[PDB]
């Protein structure tokens, strides 16, 4: 009969459904593919870290050609470069320029700090854009470092300065009027964003008062 | 009636072969874990990325950046505030845990007469305290497969030693053997856990007689 | 009626599974998917480059789990070096034939004119039947210079080989002068290769061009 | 052979589409999917609550594009109030039958004992054939108190109705005393309803319990 | 041969009905845009969420919080630094743009003799400058569909007025008509753009004679 | 023939592929469903904003029951509540407690500021946790407000204080030793996180020196 053979066909199916669920199940057990977003982070971490050809205050054009042009020429407003590597986002980027990025690490004073090396925090307070501007900001920030754990106090000096594209280096000094203010030099070049090799200097001679390897925050 | 229903089967029979072939794919898929491969590269690269710190000092985590003396830092209680150690990922016993067998090729400078060959370090036993992270005392069996005049022979000696959590080092010295075949030494950071870089050395000399790169053999 | 209610059941369930099936076939393909492979393998390379190298400059590192060093001359004998079987599994010869490559200058001590560009046309390529390791090439190096007086065009022909393992093609100098080109690959990825112009004997580098494969 | 090469072609393409098909059927279901509907409609409600209200307290706001106010008594006559047709499209009567609801006290001026809890069992429910708008109920209000002396248990029975639009069930006081219960729904969502115990005449609130549907 | 191939068709014919039914679903799907519905709630709620500011002042954006006098703020040039105005989302001509027809029910207090009814405001013309955001001068046609003794009639008068970008207000006054039927006034913030809240009013009195909630009729 | 009828079958298919692509295409044209993550944000924005029963310094238990308990009793360490609403994450949350949240708005001084209302920024510098602690931090922050646009200068006073769970209110005062320091009161209760109704006060009398509606950052 009609009713019949059907009663089992629906079974052969109710079957497959299970042999499959017992699969989709054994699937979830095995993890989810890491978020291309992972590889990307590797290629990054890696890429940040080898020499570049250029002697100082020249930087290479972003793109395929190596070619080295002097740091200064940015910007014409126009593509200094033939390549126009510039025009590409990785150069004109928002995040890069973006203000109110903060970097911290554990400052261990060669010089000052009798006490046990304390937390240093150099954070950006404002930095000039205009519209177009592919380039490096000329900026203001704050350098804060704990007095103590005990004291629960903390020094906060205001700074002025810029960021060198070519150098990958952040150079800040006390704004003024303090006459002793302290300043700070942070080198990018892991190649990473986040990470920098900062050193608290004396705004005079640019002599290293203390050193701290920083991360963002 | 009979056609649309008897044919709706040639449709189902298909899913049967499909679902089956699909099983084979789920088997192929388990062999390439991406999340695994990526980890290989991470470790592979981290391996490339020296110490700032001084030797037999412990580098803290991201937050600060400080050096701590090894013995002090692996108190077993928290060395530091944070603490780097306390976080479960490092302390995790399992990966570390011995009982593993490690094999690999031992290329000699040729302090030993004998041609290159394979060594097979296999952890016999391992005491600590109940907890006990820092230090792991252990006994192990070191074999080699070398040819004498005549057929394939196997030189096994028994060894005693320790594993230094921080050191990422496994030191195996001979017991009291007449052979007293020279002491093996392996370090962790391959960046795999599995894998280790070893060397045969003499105690007194504390020279390196041979290079040996081992890999944990699968238990199954 | 009775017949009908029946018949419908089985269709909509055959598909309800045909989905769960291809659904997995996807998750699988995701862990095999080739774009991920190269991308990761590529990363591996960057690492292989770091460090005092397992194998020699001359010697080739088989891999991998267990290292082993064999000569660059040494693979691809046709005997197997490798347990691994590297000397025979790398299915593809980097070196085709007919390819054109455009080089963009970026450092030219080397020529007087320094040209902007420099095309590299591959005329012929043949491998000896016995030798995998080395493929012999015949290439025309084209150049569009502007001279002070007039305009000059050049298409100097030169012999050269491509080595298996190195991915490094050496173009023996067209010239009597013994300025020659030496480009070392990443290889597939990228057919882009840095081309160093050197004094063949010296191996002094005096001109770097980034060569891109013209499609 | 010739036959075979042929035959294979058509299978693997029938599926290659059966996928693109159900793929869309998904994207569609995603814009219809009911969990999204209620979730959004729910939001709408929160808004309908803000403000000096279109319709009256008594009156019901039809909607929607064009407002229109009709009596709460007024729908669901069976004549249509609404262009819209609200008085007849809301397919489901909130009020079933047999349901038990557990109330958790949280403010009880009202009783001496104040109980922790208060079960509300619905015995019967009938709608008059002519009246949609109001469904009459018979309910037993159970209570597990502890008295000072002993333990007391109670199951006072009371009549009550549920109004259509209001989602507000009024349970006429079991007691002579004329303490009655008045719970106003969100309705489906949630069968959870705040239950106010009031002096039926006064409509003074003097006890609030959050009632949850027991499954 | 003939079976596995002639049957592989009853398999394809299926996809034909499927793909077709699938077309119907893609049609149903275009009617419920989620991204649309959500927007209705946003606006619906934002409508519930008075002015801090003083009337005929302009509230700036998130960054600061400042008040600006209306005329000054819609210079047409940037009122402010930021500027709130300058951002393309508000200024966007299209939604605003007239030529729309708006209908809806006009419930009277009954300054007019006549029973409730529908009004149909339809924008006739609209000048500005070329740019010209702030202010939009416009002519429009106001009709009602009301019953006289006898059949359905339609009272249309022509109107002139303006739209105030900031005001979110559309004012329509009668031209020179003998009827001089009273002036209509609509405000934006429904929170839909489409929809507006209107009132019939007298100039002199500047009372509200009636409530009228209009909705833009679809052009197609 | 065999070869034959096949030549068209593959066509009937090459067909479907197109009638489908012309669909999957008309699909992408129509936007992607907004990221349940959207509705969630609405239910939030909405929920933050009606009264609560409790008279002051009592707050309701999170869950289904309304019930009101005194603010203080948190924590026993243990569930003060019957409901144990507490134990739920929305109460013990990380983000909520999380330090180094910053709120800013445009401060318009009733009192001090001759000049044109300037930017105020109250940001959290540290705040005590222990382990368990479901509850409110007792914390330290900084209040900064521009002198001018012109000057490009800015006042930065350090503060001490706590956050009232019940109140939803952030109460900070000058740490000390300044003797004139200024303090700040910020009320949560939109119900939102981000948004607050801050007012710069005088740490004495708690008298409103200026007011600024803030957002995070």
From TrEMBL, chains A, F:
PROSITE patterns: LDLRA_1 (PS01209), LDLRA_2 (PS50068). Residues 13-52 form a coiled coil. Residues 97-216 form the Annelid erythrocruorin linker subunit C-terminal domain. SUPFAM superfamilies: Extracellular hemoglobin linker subunit, receptor domain, Heterotrimerisation domain of extracellular hemoglobin linker subunits, LDL receptor-like module. Keywords: Calcium, Coiled coil, Disulfide bond, Metal-binding, Signal. One of its GO terms (molecular function) is metal ion binding. It comes from the Eukaryota. Disulfide bonds join 54-68, 61-81, 75-92, 112-209, 186-198. Ca(2+) binds at residues 73, 76, 78, 80, 86-87. This is Hemoglobin linker chain L1. It comes from Lumbricus terrestris.
Automatic annotation (TrEMBL), chains B, E:
The keyword Transcription does not apply. Residues 96-215 form the Annelid erythrocruorin linker subunit C-terminal domain. Keywords: Calcium, Disulfide bond, Metal-binding, Signal. Coiled coil: none annotated. GO terms for molecular function: metal ion binding. Disulfide bonds join 53-67, 60-80, 74-91, 111-209, 186-198. Ca(2+) binds at residues 72, 75, 77, 79, 85-86. This is Extracellular hemoglobin linker L2 subunit. It comes from Lumbricus terrestris.
Automatic annotation (TrEMBL), chains C, D:
Pfam families: Eryth_link_C, Ldl_recept_a. InterPro entries: Eryth_link_C (IPR031639), Eryth_link_C_sf (IPR036153), Extrac_hemoglob_link_heterodim (IPR037246), LDL_receptor-like_sf (IPR036055), LDLR_class-A_CS (IPR023415), LDrepeatLR_classA_rpt (IPR002172). Ca(2+) binds at residues 74, 77, 79, 81, 87-88. Residues 94-214 form the Annelid erythrocruorin linker subunit C-terminal domain. The keyword Metal-binding applies. One of its GO terms (molecular function) is metal ion binding. Keywords: Calcium, Disulfide bond, Metal-binding, Signal. Disulfide bonds join 55-69, 62-82, 76-91, 110-206. This is Extracellular hemoglobin linker L3 subunit.
């Amino acid at each position: 009969r009609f009713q019949y053979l059907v009663k089992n066909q629906n079974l052969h199916i109710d079957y497959l459904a299970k042999k499959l669920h017992d699969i989709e199940e054994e699937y979830n057990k095995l993890t989810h593919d890491v978020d291309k977003k992972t590889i990307r982070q590797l290629k990054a971490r890696i890429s940040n870290l080898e020499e570049h050809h250029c002697d100082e205050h020249e930087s290479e054009c972003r793109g395929d050609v190596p070619e080295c042009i002097h740091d200064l020429l940015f910007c014409d407003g126009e593509k200094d470069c033939r390549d126009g590597s510039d025009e590409d986002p990785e150069t004109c980027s928002l995040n890069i320029t973006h203000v109110g990025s903060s970097y911290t690490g554990l400052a261990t004073w060669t010089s000052c700090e009798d006490l046990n090396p304390d937390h240093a925090i150099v954070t950006i307070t404002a930095a000039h854009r205009k519209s177009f501007f592919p380039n490096r900001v000329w900026l203001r920030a704050t350098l804060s470092y704990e007095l103590d754990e005990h004291d629960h106090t903390v020094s906060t000096t205001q700074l002025r300065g810029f960021y060198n594209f070519g150098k990958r280096e952040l150079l800040l000094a006390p704004l003024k009027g303090q006459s002793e203010g302290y300043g700070v030099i942070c080198d990018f070049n892991l190649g990473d964003d986040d990470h920098a090799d900062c050193k608290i200097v004396v705004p005079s001679s640019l002599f290293v008062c203390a050193h701290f390897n920083a991360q963002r925050y | 009636l009979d056609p649309r229903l008897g044919a709706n089967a040639f449709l189902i029979i298909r899913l049967d072969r499909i679902i089956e072939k699909l099983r084979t794919k789920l088997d192929e898929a388990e062999k390439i874990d991406p999340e695994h491969f990526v980890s290989e590269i991470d470790a592979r690269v981290t391996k490339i990325e020296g110490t700032h710190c001084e030797k037999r000092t412990f580098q803290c985590g991201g937050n600060e950046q400080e050096c701590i003396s090894d013995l002090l830092v692996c108190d077993g209680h928290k060395d530091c505030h944070n603490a780097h150690d306390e976080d479960p990922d490092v302390c995790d016993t399992s990966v570390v845990k011995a009982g593993n067998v490690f094999s690999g090729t031992s290329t000699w400078h040729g302090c030993l007469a004998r041609e290159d060959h394979v060594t097979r370090i296999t952890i016999t036993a391992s005491k600590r305290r109940k907890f006990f992270t820092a230090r792991i005392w252990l006994r192990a069996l070191v074999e080699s497969e070398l040819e004498r005049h005549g057929e394939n022979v196997t030189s096994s000696f028994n060894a005693k030693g320790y594993y230094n959590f921080a050191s990422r080092r496994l030191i195996l010295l001979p017991t009291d053997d007449h052979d007293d075949h020279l002491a093996v030494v392996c370090s962790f950071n391959r960046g795999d856990n599995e894998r280790a870089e070893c060397h045969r050395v003499t105690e007194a000399t504390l020279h390196q007689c041979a290079d040996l790169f081992v890999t944990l053999e699968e238990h199954d | 009626q009775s017949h009908d209610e029946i018949i419908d059941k089985l269709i909509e369930r055959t598909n309800k599974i045909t989905t769960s099936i291809s659904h997995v076939e996807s998750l699988l393909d995701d862990r095999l998917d080739p774009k991920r492979i190269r991308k990761a393998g590529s990363l591996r390379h960057r690492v292989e480059e770091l460090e005092d190298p397992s194998c020699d400059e001359h010697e080739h590192q088989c891999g991998g789990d267990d290292p082993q060093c064999i000569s660059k001359l040494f693979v691809c004998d046709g005997h197997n070096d490798c347990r691994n079987g590297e000397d025979e599994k790398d299915c593809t010869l980097p070196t085709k034939a007919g390819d054109k490559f455009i080089g963009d200058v970026c450092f030219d001590h080397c020529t007087k004119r320094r040209p902007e560009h420099m095309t590299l046309a591959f005329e012929s390529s043949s491998i000896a039947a016995f030798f995998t390791p080395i493929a012999d090439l015949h290439v025309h190096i084209e150049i569009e210079s502007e001279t002070d007086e007039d305009e000059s065009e050049v298409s100097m022909p030169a012999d050269g080989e491509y080595s298996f393992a190195d991915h490094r093609l050496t173009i023996h100098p067209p010239e009597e002068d013994g300025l020659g080109l030496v480009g070392e690959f990443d290889g597939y990825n990228f057919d882009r290769f840095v081309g160093h112009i050197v004094h063949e004997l010296s191996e002094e580098v005096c001109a770097e061009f980034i060569f891109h494969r013209k499609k």
